[PDB]
Amino acid sequence: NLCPFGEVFNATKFPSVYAWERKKISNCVADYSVLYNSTFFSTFKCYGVSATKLNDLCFSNVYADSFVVKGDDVRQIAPGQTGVIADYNYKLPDDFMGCVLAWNTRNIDATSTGNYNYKYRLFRKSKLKPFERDISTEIYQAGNKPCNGVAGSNCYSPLQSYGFRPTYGVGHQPYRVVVLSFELLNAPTVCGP
Amino acid sequence: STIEEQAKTFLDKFNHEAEDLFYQSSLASWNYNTNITEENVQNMNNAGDKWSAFLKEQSTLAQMYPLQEIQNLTVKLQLQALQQNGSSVLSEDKSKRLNTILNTMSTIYSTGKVCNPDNPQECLLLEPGLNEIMANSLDYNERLWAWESWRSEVGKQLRPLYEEYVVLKNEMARANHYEDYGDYWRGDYEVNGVDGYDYSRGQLIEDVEHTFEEIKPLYEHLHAYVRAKLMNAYPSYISPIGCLPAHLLGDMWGRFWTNLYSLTVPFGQKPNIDVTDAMVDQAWDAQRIFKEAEKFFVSVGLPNMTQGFWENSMLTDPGNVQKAVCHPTAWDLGKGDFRILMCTKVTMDDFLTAHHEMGHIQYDMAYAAQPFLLRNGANEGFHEAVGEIMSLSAATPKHLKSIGLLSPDFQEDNETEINFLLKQALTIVGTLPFTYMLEKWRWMVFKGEIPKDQWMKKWWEMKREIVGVVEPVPHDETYCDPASLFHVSNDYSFIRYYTRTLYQFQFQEALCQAAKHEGPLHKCDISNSTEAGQKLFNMLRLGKSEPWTLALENVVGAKNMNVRPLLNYFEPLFTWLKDQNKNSFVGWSTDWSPYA
Numbered sequence: 001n002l003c004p005f006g007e008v009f010n011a012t013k014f015p016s017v018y019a020w021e022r023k024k025i026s027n028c029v030a031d032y033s034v035l036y037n038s039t040f041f042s043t044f045k046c047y048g049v050s051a052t053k054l055n056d057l058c059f060s061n062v063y064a065d066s067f068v069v070k071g072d073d074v075r076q077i078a079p080g081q082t083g084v085i086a087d088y089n090y091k092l093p094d095d096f097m098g099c100v101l102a103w104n105t106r107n108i109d110a111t112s113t114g115n116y117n118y119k120y121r122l123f124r125k126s127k128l129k130p131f132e133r134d135i136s137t138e139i140y141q142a143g144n145k146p147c148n149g150v151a152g153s154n155c156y157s158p159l160q161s162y163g164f165r166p167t168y169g170v171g172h173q174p175y176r177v178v179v180l181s182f183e184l185l186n187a188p189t190v191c192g193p
Numbered sequence: 194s195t196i197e198e199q200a201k202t203f204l205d206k207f208n209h210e211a212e213d214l215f216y217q218s219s220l221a222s223w224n225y226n227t228n229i230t231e232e233n234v235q236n237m238n239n240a241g242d243k244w245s246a247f248l249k250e251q252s253t254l255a256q257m258y259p260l261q262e263i264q265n266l267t268v269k270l271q272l273q274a275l276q277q278n279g280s281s282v283l284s285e286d287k288s289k290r291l292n293t294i295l296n297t298m299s300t301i302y303s304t305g306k307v308c309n310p311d312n313p314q315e316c317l318l319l320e321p322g323l324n325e326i327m328a329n330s331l332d333y334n335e336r337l338w339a340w341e342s343w344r345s346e347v348g349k350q351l352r353p354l355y356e357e358y359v360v361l362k363n364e365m366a367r368a369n370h371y372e373d374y375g376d377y378w379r380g381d382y383e384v385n386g387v388d389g390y391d392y393s394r395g396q397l398i399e400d401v402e403h404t405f406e407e408i409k410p411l412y413e414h415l416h417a418y419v420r421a422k423l424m425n426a427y428p429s430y431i432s433p434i435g436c437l438p439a440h441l442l443g444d445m446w447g448r449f450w451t452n453l454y455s456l457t458v459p460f461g462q463k464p465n466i467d468v469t470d471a472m473v474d475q476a477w478d479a480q481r482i483f484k485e486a487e488k489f490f491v492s493v494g495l496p497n498m499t500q501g502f503w504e505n506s507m508l509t510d511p512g513n514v515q516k517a518v519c520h521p522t523a524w525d526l527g528k529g530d531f532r533i534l535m536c537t538k539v540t541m542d543d544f545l546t547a548h549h550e551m552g553h554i555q556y557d558m559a560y561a562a563q564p565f566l567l568r569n570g571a572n573e574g575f576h577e578a579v580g581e582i583m584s585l586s587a588a589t590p591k592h593l594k595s596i597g598l599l600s601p602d603f604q605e606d607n608e609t610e611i612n613f614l615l616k617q618a619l620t621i622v623g624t625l626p627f628t629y630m631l632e633k634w635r636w637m638v639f640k641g642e643i644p645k646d647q648w649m650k651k652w653w654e655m656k657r658e659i660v661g662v663v664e665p666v667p668h669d670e671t672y673c674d675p676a677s678l679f680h681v682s683n684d685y686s687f688i689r690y691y692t693r694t695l696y697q698f699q700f701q702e703a704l705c706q707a708a709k710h711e712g713p714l715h716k717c718d719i720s721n722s723t724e725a726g727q728k729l730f731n732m733l734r735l736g737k738s739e740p741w742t743l744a745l746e747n748v749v750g751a752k753n754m755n756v757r758p759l760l761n762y763f764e765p766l767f768t769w770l771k772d773q774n775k776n777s778f779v780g781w782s783t784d785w786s787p788y789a
């Protein structure tokens with residue numbers, strides 16, 4: 001039985017980077033001739049292991065995380081970054097073993113009036129631990145003011161939304177990003193003969 | 194959280210909230226300037242009003258953080274610009290009245306038509322009617338009509354509106370802690386806080402004059418040379434010792450003396466380096482002109498033009514199907530969108546104009562990494578200095594033959610170099626006393642030094658004294674000839690064109706110096722010099738973050754503007770000009786008038 005990689009990549013809608021999603025993959029054969037035999041990607045940079053001998057490798061379970069980020073911020077899906085996304089939306093561990101994938105989606109994630117669905121967190125007290133996730137919409141306190149559940153002076157709503165217009169530059173263009181994390185354990189799944 | 198930390202997170206929220214509104218407001222202004230429809234002109238003002246309403250709201254929210262508490266130099270500058278009370282410091286009705294008179298001055302200037310007394314059925318406006326006369330006509334009476342009609346018709350309508358424009362704008366400046374409106378404009382050059390790099394609003398008046406005092410000798414010789422030539426084209430109309438009549442100066446206002454080249458050409462027997470015939474006869478199109486432009490910047494170490502620039506820029510006249518504005522512009526919509534709007538014609542002038550506006554884009558593409566409030570030139574005169582450096586390097590005959598528009602067998606005599614420098618002098622140095630005298634008068638009017646009973650009387654005292662130009666017909670206070678120029682009637686500061694002329698030659702000399710250029714400075718092509726490119730790039734990326742004096746040092750190595758690069762550029766012409774005035778009078782008597 002095959003691993004459903006297409007279910008995380010070829011999916012219809014993708015989540016916002018602040019509220020990204022994960023998908024755990026267990027016992028199944030893994031055909032990676034779909035990814036390396038493809039010039040369709042705009043990044044494809046691996047960490048911890050090569051891009052080809054992953055066919056003959058086995059892990060306890062593989063974690064596929066996916067979201068959408070502007071073209072410029074794809075720079076931050078790498079171990080040890082300190083941008084807005086890496087700190088408040090999706091942080092990777094320094095001991096990350098896996099690959100990062102990304103492909104331009106201006107045709108389907110950018111509209112004439114601007115696709116404001118895709119959002120990112122701009123304000124958050126303390127960074128994110130690796131693989132942490134925060135869907136909080138609490139009114140962020142920037143000054144010494146109580147916010148009383150209201151936003152305004154020294155109280156800023158933390159989430160900001162991309163305004164994906166199809167005429168933006170490559171940097172400010174939507175890029176669907178899927179990150180494949182590899183879990184190792186002394187317990188007894190994802191090989192590929 | 195400290196006062197500085199709250200202001201920083203406020204700037205963080207502001208930048209990401211201003212980026213999206215500026216793009217929507219700039220796209221709507223692009224939808225009108227490329228497609229004149231009533232649906233897009235309302236789409237323009239709604240996005241433009243939302244942008245201004247967002248600003249005046251955020252202007253007060255920036256005042257929430259007192260500037261005196263900030264020690265971070267970047268956040269301090271940004272908060273300063275946002276807190277500019279500006280027009281909001283006026284009362285409701287006075288501000289609304291001010292906006293009304295600013296549009297009417299723009300309206301009667303853009304819609305003012307003069308009618309021919311000979312043929313009253315033919316009535317012309319400035320473009321193309323009056324400008325074509327003042328540029329091409331040789332009839333003294335015809336040029337006198339076109340010059341005077343625009344000042345006695347449009348300029349007279351502008352006179353009461355400009356009197357009220359001064360007092361209302363003075364109410365804005367003083368309420369914003371300024372001496373006058375001329376002090377407000379001089380604040381663009383102000384640097385306040387950085388040790389060793391400070392520069393005051395009074396410093397501008399001092400330095401521009403100190404450099405202008407050293408500019409007089411070259412201009413005095415160019416004046417005497419042009420004057421003697423004009424005596425031949427208008428015999429018994431010009432005194433060999435008096436000033437030049439204002440209507441014989443090439444255009445409607447005498448801003449540039451380019452059109453006098455057909456009269457003042459030193460060696461007319463020489464073939465001109467104008468390759469306009471080569472561009473038309475080679476079936477070049479607007480694409481070839483701008484793709485050749487991009488090739489220039491890349492071969493110096495600068496990035497390409499974005500694909501959004503390629504598909505979305507308007508590079509041709511939109512035809513009979515689409516009515517649009519055709520003023521050559523370079524658009525920086527933000528969010529990594531850069532475009533150029535230009536109804537390009539296949540002529541040499543557009544090949545150099547394509548390099549000017551594309552220089553703006555390269556400047557825009559560089560400082561896009563700065564925060565939103567600092568994505569701008571170091572001062573108002575920095576961007577146009579960049580656009581003209583491309584026009585300078587691309588105009589050299591060596592660059593023309595390296596592109597394929599000039600034949601390899603073009604021999605560069607000391608005559609064809611004097612023809613070119615005289616060609617460059619009529620448009621560059623000729624506008625410097627004009628630009629200075631104009632802003633000098635505006636600074637004094639805003640200062641209240643020229644009472645309304647002698648506005649025009651003092652205006653022409655400086656015209657004859659500073660620039661060396663006399664009115665052909667006597668003008669009283671009913672006229673408003675200053676407001677007969679676009680920048681004066683449309684609230685544009687004008688000293689930036691003087692300062693850009695001094696900035697541009699400091700840049701070009703230092704960049705050609707970095708390119709190991711050896712011959713005359715005017716003979717320098719910067720192409721293939723990746724070394725000089727990164728030198729200039731060190732300044733383009735700074736934007737408005739660094740003080741303009743500091744950013745100027747990173748390219749030229751100087752703290753203040755300098756005239757010597759301008760003097761050295763025109764050194765072959767200045768010595769030859771000294772010769773051509775050996776039996777001619779340099780200087781002018783301010784008292785001679787072409788009337789009684």
Ligand SMILES: *[C@@H]1O[C@H](CO)[C@@H](O[C@@H]2O[C@H](CO)[C@@H](O[C@@H]3O[C@H](CO)[C@@H](O)[C@H](O)[C@@H]3O)[C@H](O)[C@H]2NC(C)=O)[C@H](O)[C@H]1NC(C)=O
Pocket residue numbers: 005006007009010033034
């Ligand atoms: C998302 O959907 C696309 C298209 O439905 C999938 O790409 C397809 O992948 C298959 C298998 O890799 C390709 O089939 C053929 O495989 C044989 C194996 O021997 C190979 O020799 C052929 O050259 C060919 O690659 C198919 O051509 C390919 N189609 C396209 C349009 O790329 C993709 O696998 C899906 N996403 C994921 C993550 O699986």
Ligand SMILES: *[C@@H]1O[C@H](CO)[C@@H](O[C@@H]2O[C@H](CO)[C@@H](O[C@@H]3O[C@H](CO)[C@@H](O)[C@H](O)[C@@H]3O)[C@H](O)[C@H]2NC(C)=O)[C@H](O)[C@H]1NC(C)=O
Pocket residue numbers: 082264265266267268
């Ligand atoms: C005023 O405050 C700003 C806050 O934005 C200061 O600028 C920021 O300074 C930090 C500290 O060096 C920079 O962080 C660095 O980011 C790079 C990104 O690649 C990262 O690799 C480094 O490890 C480090 O974390 C940050 O980039 C910088 N941001 C900007 C826009 O300049 C600034 O220094 C303060 N100035 C003064 C005079 O206090």
Ligand SMILES: *[C@@H]1O[C@H](CO)[C@@H](O[C@@H]2O[C@H](CO)[C@@H](O)[C@H](O)[C@H]2NC(C)=O)[C@H](O)[C@H]1NC(C)=O
Pocket residue numbers: 228230231232233515
């Ligand atoms: C010029 O502007 C108009 C609107 O000001 C653009 O929109 C056209 O007109 C109506 C507006 O709702 C639409 O139904 C049409 O389909 C639009 N297109 C055309 C071709 O009429 C118009 O697109 C603009 N033209 C260009 C070339 O950008």
Ligand SMILES: *[C@@H]1O[C@H](CO)[C@@H](O[C@@H]2O[C@H](CO)[C@@H](O)[C@H](O)[C@H]2NC(C)=O)[C@H](O)[C@H]1NC(C)=O
Pocket residue numbers: 491496497
């Ligand atoms: C700048 O853009 C030009 C595009 O004209 C690049 O030229 C490339 O060269 C080959 C030969 O024509 C083309 O097949 C490529 O597709 C061109 N690239 C592009 C993006 O069109 C040139 O390489 C670019 N250089 C830099 C430094 O950006």
Ligand SMILES: *[C@@H]1O[C@H](CO)[C@@H](O[C@@H]2O[C@H](CO)[C@@H](O)[C@H](O)[C@H]2NC(C)=O)[C@H](O)[C@H]1NC(C)=O
Pocket residue numbers: 591592594595596718720721
């Ligand atoms: C910079 O050096 C390059 C080196 O090739 C020159 O490029 C060639 O020169 C002529 C015109 O001078 C063109 O017709 C050729 O097609 C160019 N080659 C290519 C591959 O495009 C270039 O001219 C030099 N530029 C200068 C000296 O300004």
Ligand SMILES: *[C@@H]1O[C@H](CO)[C@@H](O)[C@H](O)[C@H]1NC(C)=O
Pocket residue numbers: 256276277278282369
């Ligand atoms: C702007 O004007 C208000 C009053 O209208 C004043 O309190 C405030 O200090 C001014 N701010 C600046 C920066 O001039």
Ligand SMILES: [Cl-]
Pocket residue numbers: 446674675
């Ligand atoms: Cl005048």
Ligand SMILES: [Zn+2]
Pocket residue numbers: 549550553576577580
């Ligand atoms: Zn320009």
